[PDB]
Amino acid sequence: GSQGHDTVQPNFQQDKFLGRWYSAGLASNSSWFREKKAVLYMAKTVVAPSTEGGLNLTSTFLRKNQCETKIMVLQPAGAPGHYTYSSPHSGSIHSVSVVEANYDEYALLFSRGTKGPGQDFRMATLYSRTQTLKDELKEKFTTFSKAQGLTEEDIVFLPQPDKCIQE
């Protein structure tokens, strides 16, 4: 059937099981992320098979000649394409699904949150396999964003002028 349950498209690839990714594409209704732009930090996420029977995406960012490590556990949420991770807390679970993965040089990711007091938070991510992103590739997020009824104020590409490895 149509509508009701089709916000994300199913597509499981061998690479999805494990691969290196860059924390590209950022979109938020609020201005929380913007307040973080003043610091400018980029984290590289990599999901590797864990002993728990799942994958573990570790995001590592380098900000101001400083690199930090972040470990995240992702487990299957039933049907393929949908996965969720149990964030450290008294019962906080964030559900994240991947709309579609391009076989060119980019990937579309969509994040959703409860927003503190169940304010239903909406997050959109545009990861880039390359070091950066093209306004062209940015164009895909713009057309879709404008099509949905959102301005550029909601979408922004976080810069990564540091590279924890490359230099």
Rounded alpha-carbon distances, angstroms, from residue 148 to 8, 30, 105, 118, 155:
15, 16, 24, 22, 12
CA distance 97 to 112: 8
CA 78 to chain centre: 20
Contact between 10 and 139 under an 8 Å Cβ cutoff? The reply is no
Contact between 59 and 72 under an 8 Å Cβ cutoff? The reply is yes
Largest Cα separation within the chain, whole Å, is 51
Q: Which domain holds residue 164?
A: 1-167
CA distance 71 to 59: 7
Strand partners, 61: 43, 68
Q: How many CB atoms lie within 10 A of CB 23?
A: 20
Q: Would you mind telling me the total number of residues written for the chain in this entry?
A: 167
The DSSP code sequence of 50-69 is: -TTSSEEEEEEEE-SS-EE-
Q: Given the structure tokens 């089709």, which residue do they identify?
A: 6
CA distance 64 to 78: 40
CATH number (domain holding residue 146): 2.40.128.20
Q: Given the structure tokens 């400018």, which residue do they identify?
A: 40
CA distance 1 to 33: 37
**Tokens matching residue 90:** 């008294």
Q: 3-class SS at 121?
A: strand
CA distance 30 to 123: 10
Number of domains in the chain: 1
Of all helices (H) and strands (E), which one includes residue 140? helix 135-148
In sequence order, which ranges of 59-148 are alpha helices (DSSP H)? 135-148
- Do the bridges between strand 82-87 and strand 106-113 make them parallel or antiparallel, or are there none, so unpaired? unpaired
**Tokens matching residue 82:** 């949908």
**How was this structure obtained?**
NMR
